[PDB]
Enzyme design. Structure first.
Site, PDB file in Angstrom:
ATOM      1  N   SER A 146      -5.131   5.894  -5.257  1.00 31.06           N
ATOM      2  CA  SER A 146      -5.761   6.385  -3.947  1.00 31.06           C
ATOM      3  C   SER A 146      -4.686   6.200  -2.819  1.00 31.06           C
ATOM      4  O   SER A 146      -3.498   5.672  -3.167  1.00 31.06           O
ATOM      5  CB  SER A 146      -6.659   5.455  -3.432  1.00 31.06           C
ATOM      6  OG  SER A 146      -6.528   4.116  -3.086  1.00 31.06           O
ATOM      7  N   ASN A 152      -9.185   5.199   3.362  1.00 33.04           N
ATOM      8  CA  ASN A 152      -8.944   5.024   1.811  1.00 33.04           C
ATOM      9  C   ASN A 152      -9.775   6.248   0.935  1.00 33.04           C
ATOM     10  O   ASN A 152     -10.856   6.342   1.210  1.00 33.04           O
ATOM     11  CB  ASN A 152      -9.381   3.752   1.215  1.00 33.04           C
ATOM     12  CG  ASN A 152      -8.820   3.725  -0.330  1.00 33.04           C
ATOM     13  OD1 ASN A 152      -9.854   3.815  -1.225  1.00 33.04           O
ATOM     14  ND2 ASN A 152      -7.540   3.326  -0.482  1.00 33.04           N
ATOM     15  N   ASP A 200      -4.016   2.073  -7.335  1.00 31.35           N
ATOM     16  CA  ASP A 200      -4.937   2.722  -7.880  1.00 31.35           C
ATOM     17  C   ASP A 200      -4.997   4.013  -8.018  1.00 31.35           C
ATOM     18  O   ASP A 200      -6.141   4.674  -8.467  1.00 31.35           O
ATOM     19  CB  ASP A 200      -6.440   2.080  -7.433  1.00 31.35           C
ATOM     20  CG  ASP A 200      -6.792   2.374  -6.012  1.00 31.35           C
ATOM     21  OD1 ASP A 200      -5.961   2.947  -5.590  1.00 31.35           O
ATOM     22  OD2 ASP A 200      -7.976   2.027  -5.766  1.00 31.35           O
ATOM     23  N   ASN A 247      -1.531   3.856  -3.064  1.00 31.30           N
ATOM     24  CA  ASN A 247      -1.886   2.497  -3.696  1.00 31.30           C
ATOM     25  C   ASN A 247      -1.687   2.546  -5.400  1.00 31.30           C
ATOM     26  O   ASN A 247      -1.678   3.774  -5.808  1.00 31.30           O
ATOM     27  CB  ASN A 247      -3.235   2.047  -3.241  1.00 31.30           C
ATOM     28  CG  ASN A 247      -3.458   2.015  -1.804  1.00 31.30           C
ATOM     29  OD1 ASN A 247      -2.702   1.201  -1.236  1.00 31.30           O
ATOM     30  ND2 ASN A 247      -4.176   2.935  -1.174  1.00 31.30           N
ATOM     31  N   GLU A 288      -2.269  -1.342  11.007  1.00 31.29           N
ATOM     32  CA  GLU A 288      -2.386  -0.184   9.947  1.00 31.29           C
ATOM     33  C   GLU A 288      -1.498   0.906   9.922  1.00 31.29           C
ATOM     34  O   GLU A 288      -1.136   1.307   9.004  1.00 31.29           O
ATOM     35  CB  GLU A 288      -3.980   0.112  10.062  1.00 31.29           C
ATOM     36  CG  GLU A 288      -5.225  -0.827   9.726  1.00 31.29           C
ATOM     37  CD  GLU A 288      -5.123  -1.244   8.210  1.00 31.29           C
ATOM     38  OE1 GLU A 288      -4.437  -0.719   7.295  1.00 31.29           O
ATOM     39  OE2 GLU A 288      -5.585  -2.228   7.728  1.00 31.29           O
ATOM     40  N   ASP A 334      -4.005   5.749   1.523  1.00 29.83           N
ATOM     41  CA  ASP A 334      -4.864   5.512   3.034  1.00 29.83           C
ATOM     42  C   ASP A 334      -4.256   6.653   3.936  1.00 29.83           C
ATOM     43  O   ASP A 334      -3.110   6.706   3.966  1.00 29.83           O
ATOM     44  CB  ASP A 334      -4.175   4.105   3.379  1.00 29.83           C
ATOM     45  CG  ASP A 334      -5.001   3.021   2.349  1.00 29.83           C
ATOM     46  OD1 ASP A 334      -5.744   3.133   1.696  1.00 29.83           O
ATOM     47  OD2 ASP A 334      -4.470   1.781   2.591  1.00 29.83           O
TER      48      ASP A 334
END
Ligand SMILES: [Cl-]
Length: 127
Positions: A50, A59, A48, A46, A35, A52
């Site tokens: 968002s 998220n 959308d 991301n 990760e 991380d």
């Protein structure tokens, strides 16, 4: 900071992740490797809107609040900024909530694709 493998395993064990909700410690170490490459400050945007955050790439649409993600739910009740600390407490506490939500460690895409099905206890061998 960038953790070493056994260094993070020991910290994750102190924070109660070994066997948590059915997931042995090697799962969590493997997840962090793929990760965040063990970096507590990793961030990734991301499609959308968002982002991380941190060692476990938590998220901002569902779990932490970063103030700039549409559809935020903040189910961990934590600002995303706290998940960039070198101290893993806040990331672990939110991870415990994520993994308790009903779909196990499948919230972590890198774990699903690159850890699940392998001998994950290799990630704590020698520690
Ligand atoms: Cl934030």
């Amino acid at each position: 900071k960038v953790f070493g493998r056994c260094e993070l395993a020991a910290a994750m064990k102190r924070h109660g992740l070994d066997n948590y909700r059915g997931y042995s410690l090697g799962n969590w170490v493997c997840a962090a490797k793929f990760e965040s490459n063990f970096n507590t400050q990793a961030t990734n945007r991301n499609t959308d809107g968002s982002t991380d955050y941190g060692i476990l790439q938590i998220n901002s649409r569902w779990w932490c609040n970063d103030g700039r993600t549409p559809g935020s739910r903040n189910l961990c009740n934590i600002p995303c900024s706290a998940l960039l600390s070198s101290d893993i407490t806040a990331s672990v506490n939110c991870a415990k909530k994520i993994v308790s939500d009903g779909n196990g460690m499948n919230a972590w895409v890198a774990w699903r694709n690159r850890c699940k099905g392998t001998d994950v206890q290799a990630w704590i061998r020698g520690c």
